[PDB]
Design a binder for this molecule. Structure first.
Ligand SMILES: [Mg+2]
Ligand SMILES: [Mg+2]
Ligand SMILES: [Mg+2]
Ligand SMILES: [Mg+2]
Ligand SMILES: [Mg+2]
Ligand SMILES: [Mg+2]
Ligand SMILES: [Mg+2]
Ligand SMILES: [Mg+2]
Ligand SMILES: [Mg+2]
Ligand SMILES: [Mg+2]
Ligand SMILES: [Mg+2]
Ligand SMILES: [Mg+2]
Ligand SMILES: [Mg+2]
Ligand SMILES: [Mg+2]
Ligand SMILES: [Mg+2]
Ligand SMILES: [Mg+2]
Ligand SMILES: [Mg+2]
Ligand SMILES: [Mg+2]
Ligand SMILES: [Mg+2]
Ligand SMILES: [Mg+2]
Ligand SMILES: [Mg+2]
Ligand SMILES: [Mg+2]
Ligand SMILES: [Mg+2]
Ligand SMILES: [Mg+2]
Ligand SMILES: [Mg+2]
Ligand SMILES: [Mg+2]
Ligand SMILES: [Mg+2]
Ligand SMILES: [Mg+2]
Ligand SMILES: [Mg+2]
Ligand SMILES: [Mg+2]
Ligand SMILES: [Mg+2]
Ligand SMILES: [Mg+2]
Ligand SMILES: [Mg+2]
Ligand SMILES: [Mg+2]
Ligand SMILES: [Mg+2]
Ligand SMILES: [Mg+2]
Ligand SMILES: [Mg+2]
Ligand SMILES: [Mg+2]
Ligand SMILES: [Mg+2]
Ligand SMILES: [Mg+2]
Ligand SMILES: [Mg+2]
Ligand SMILES: [Mg+2]
Ligand SMILES: [Zn+2]
Lengths: 62, 120, 44, 132, 119
RNA sequence: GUACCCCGGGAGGGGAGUGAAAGAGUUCCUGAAACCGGUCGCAUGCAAGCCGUCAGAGCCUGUGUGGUGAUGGCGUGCCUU
RNA sequence: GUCCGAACCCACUUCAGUUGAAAAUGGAGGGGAUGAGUUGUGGAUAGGGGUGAAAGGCCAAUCAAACACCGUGAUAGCUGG
RNA sequence: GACUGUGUGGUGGAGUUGAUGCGAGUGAGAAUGCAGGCAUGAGUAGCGUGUGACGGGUGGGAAUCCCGUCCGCCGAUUAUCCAAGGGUUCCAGGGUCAAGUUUGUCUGCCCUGGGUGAGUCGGGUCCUAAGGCGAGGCCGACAGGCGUAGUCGAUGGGUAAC
């Protein structure tokens, strides 16, 4: 079908305001020598590492 | 192993069969592979079954592994290097780690690697 | 599908060329009118 | 007329308050898609904003990030402020030049394609100005 | 003598858009919609200026009724009694008394009571 | 017709310079409306609305005038035909 | 102007497409397929005219009289402004 | 009342005010009006048959560029070479505004420079078909029609290399 009338500014904005995203949350690297933000359950971009402070492992050589 | 329930990789079940075989072969050839999250999590069981078969070295076992893989250099690596590495490991020969996303299509990437350290 | 324009340079020159227009008084007047308008192309 | 203080961007965005700003004009991205990220970034601390935009999946996160960085750099050069004690005080997106293009449709029809642009403005201030 | 229309034409548009400076949506932004709405507003305001007399008289009558029924008198009897007593205070001032000076209103109620036919 | 410096791969911007003026910076005189937004004030999640009009509290402002406006009554667009 | 059947020519049915991949097609089948066959190159017939194994069919993607320009700003007791 | 102040700012940067006459391309809300710009639908439908995966490189930036290895696909054609048609798209380097239905460091795109060599191949210089034109001429109020002698005209004949 085809829109019967021009949608009003109120209704258009009511619907359009719900097209939105959320901010990425980010977590601090557990590595003391990096301390950079990364995604949770994701290897750190800055050091390529993963794991808790005690038992770290390297996932990316970057 | 278990089927994949939903729509298959590559637009056809035959192509997913081929993709998983190739991905497991590449993981065995290189030791680690960056292969998007779903492909890594989907090839983990098949690769682990192949490594478990490769743990015991016989000609029948090598032929059965060569049904999959189909590359004899990969079979040699699997029965000579990877297989002996997991003598005391009862399962869990691989691990998957999320790596980020791809810029082009937002695909969540991951690294699947074969466990590199001896259990003992 | 097959479309209306099938190019042939020989047929084009025989149909709309300068000498074809010069061959008749209607074509000569067409060339005169295109000179009057100022076309940079008088014919094909 | 013959009056002082001709209008300027600084006087309208800051007005003798400490801080700085940046504008990225003619960014070849739609204003709405840039606003989807600008709404996230507005009011945040600037360093947190740039680190978060490093991870934001949207394509507009790379332009906006640069603008923020530029604003921070400006504040580090005309005001002496440091990057870690700045917050994104204001942020908005305006429309730029929209190019017209034609996409051929079925049955000899051509539909109109609008290639929109955006101007992204970011104004940063010290964190002490958040409550003042 | 070719004339351009804009300089003369924008005057009425500015006037109408100033008169429509609280309306919702297209009625406060577009000259044609604002013009239709100002036609309706003019009709409404002319009609309500005339209906204001009746509305305020109704309110006064209600308040007078309420204040005189507290003294045991209906509005019709109160009005007839004030007419018979000769006190020509109109309903506007009667309502103003009924709100602000209730003792004066009650004394007027007594005046109206004493001036009833009682038949 | 913007030397030079800063952020940036650039585009763009920020300082600075030229100029009487740069918000006259080459998309360049003036720069309206539609349309798109940032900020502030008020209202708005029990409500039936040609979206106004009259009555009217409250809040903000008070540049003692202005903004908004809960709530009550009345109220079925414009043109052509 | 045999038969079955590819290329090739066509277009019977059906499904899809219907702002299409396409201003007539695609998938699956279907008809002819040594003949009145099909096709490349050049050529001839021109508008009250052409050509037509004949449907008013075709004559450069709307033909019971093409298209372009001119008479021309045709005329309309009609609709609209 | 159409409107308006010789009030008061802002912007602007070269014209224009009042009185009285004179002349109008003198007033727009609508013609499925014309031109431009911008909304609504809507961040919605679509992104044009399909099989890609990984390793490394380049780079500010890589699913989409380069290299390699696996795997898959066409193969009376998804191969190779011509005609017609197009016209520089070819090659090398530099580029990433625009174009490419996404990205792009890439390109049939942009800019600069370069590149095509014949006694024998395909045409002309040879020959004619259909058809065209046509000295004289015949026909026709004019305009023009036809046509002889001729002259063109390949899709054919002739002609020396692998
Ligand atoms: Mg709704
Ligand atoms: Mg199943
Ligand atoms: Mg898919
Ligand atoms: Mg199969
Ligand atoms: Mg077409
Ligand atoms: Mg009355
Ligand atoms: Mg200078
Ligand atoms: Mg100005
Ligand atoms: Mg201007
Ligand atoms: Mg409520
Ligand atoms: Mg009701
Ligand atoms: Mg037969
Ligand atoms: Mg038969
Ligand atoms: Mg037929
Ligand atoms: Mg011909
Ligand atoms: Mg018939
Ligand atoms: Mg036709
Ligand atoms: Mg007809
Ligand atoms: Mg006729
Ligand atoms: Mg006439
Ligand atoms: Mg005068
Ligand atoms: Mg006029
Ligand atoms: Mg108008
Ligand atoms: Mg109109
Ligand atoms: Mg829109
Ligand atoms: Mg969505
Ligand atoms: Mg929808
Ligand atoms: Mg949907
Ligand atoms: Mg979709
Ligand atoms: Mg490759
Ligand atoms: Mg095959
Ligand atoms: Mg050539
Ligand atoms: Mg070139
Ligand atoms: Mg070119
Ligand atoms: Mg090339
Ligand atoms: Mg190149
Ligand atoms: Mg692109
Ligand atoms: Mg390139
Ligand atoms: Mg001959
Ligand atoms: Mg003669
Ligand atoms: Mg010849
Ligand atoms: Mg030949
Ligand atoms: Zn880290």
């Amino acid at each position: 079908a085809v829109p019967k009338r021009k949608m009003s500014r109120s209704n258009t904005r009511h619907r359009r305001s719900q097209w939105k995203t959320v901010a990425t949350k980010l977590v601090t690297c557990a590595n003391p020598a990096c301390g950079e933000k990364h995604l949770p359950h994701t290897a750190c971009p800055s050091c390529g590492g993963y794991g808790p402070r005690g038992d770290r492992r390297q996932v990316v050589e970057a | 192993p278990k089927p994949t329930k939903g729509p298959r990789l590559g637009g056809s079940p035959a192509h997913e069969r081929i993709i998983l075989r190739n991905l497991a072969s590449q993981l065995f050839e290189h030791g680690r592979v960056v292969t998007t999250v779903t492909k890594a999590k989907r090839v983990r069981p098949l690769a682990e079954k192949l490594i478990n078969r490769a743990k015991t070295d016989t000609v029948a076992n090598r032929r059965f592994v060569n049904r999959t893989i189909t590359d004899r250099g990969i079979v040699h690596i699997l029965f000579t290097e990877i297989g002996p590495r997991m003598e005391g490991r009862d399962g869990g020969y691989t691990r998957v780690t999320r790596i980020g996303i791809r810029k082009g299509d937002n695909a969540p990437m991951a690294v699947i690697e074969v466990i590199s350290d001896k259990v003992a | 599908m097959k479309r209306t324009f099938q190019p042939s340079n020989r047929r084009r020159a025989r149909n709309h060329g300068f000498r074809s227009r010069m061959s008749t008084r209607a074509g000569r007047s067409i060339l005169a009118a295109r000179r009057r308008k100022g076309r940079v192309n008088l014919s094909a | 007329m013959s009056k002082t203080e001709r209008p300027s961007r600084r006087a309208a965005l800051l007005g003798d308050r400490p801080g700085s700003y940046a504008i990225a004009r003619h960014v070849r991205m739609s204003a709405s898609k840039c606003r989807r990220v600008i709404n996230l970034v507005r009011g945040m601390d600037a360093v947190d904003a740039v680190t978060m935009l490093k991870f934001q999946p949207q394509a507009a996160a790379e332009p906006i990030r640069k603008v923020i960085a530029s604003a921070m750099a400006n504040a580090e050069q005309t005001e002496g402020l440091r990057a870690d004690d700045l917050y994104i005080s204001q942020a908005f997106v305006d429309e730029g030049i929209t190019m017209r293009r034609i996409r051929p449709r079925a049955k000899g029809s051509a539909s109109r394609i609008l290639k929109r642009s955006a101007h992204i403005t970011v104004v940063v201030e010290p964190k002490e100005a958040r409550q003042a | 003598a070719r004339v351009k229309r804009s300089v003369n034409a924008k005057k009425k548009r500015r006037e109408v858009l100033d008169q429509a400076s609280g309306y919702r949506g297209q009625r406060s932004r577009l000259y044609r919609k604002a013009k239709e709405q100002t036609l309706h507003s003019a009709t409404y305001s002319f009609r309500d200026r005339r209906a204001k007399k009746g509305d305020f008289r109704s309110l006064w009558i209600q308040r007078i009724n309420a204040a005189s029924r507290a003294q045991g008198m209906t509005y019709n009897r109160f009005i007839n009694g004030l007419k018979n007593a000769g006190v020509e205070v109109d309903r506007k001032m009667l309502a103003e008394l009924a709100v602000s000076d209730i003792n004066a209103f009650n004394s007027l109620v007594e005046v109206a009571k004493a001036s009833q036919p009682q038949n």
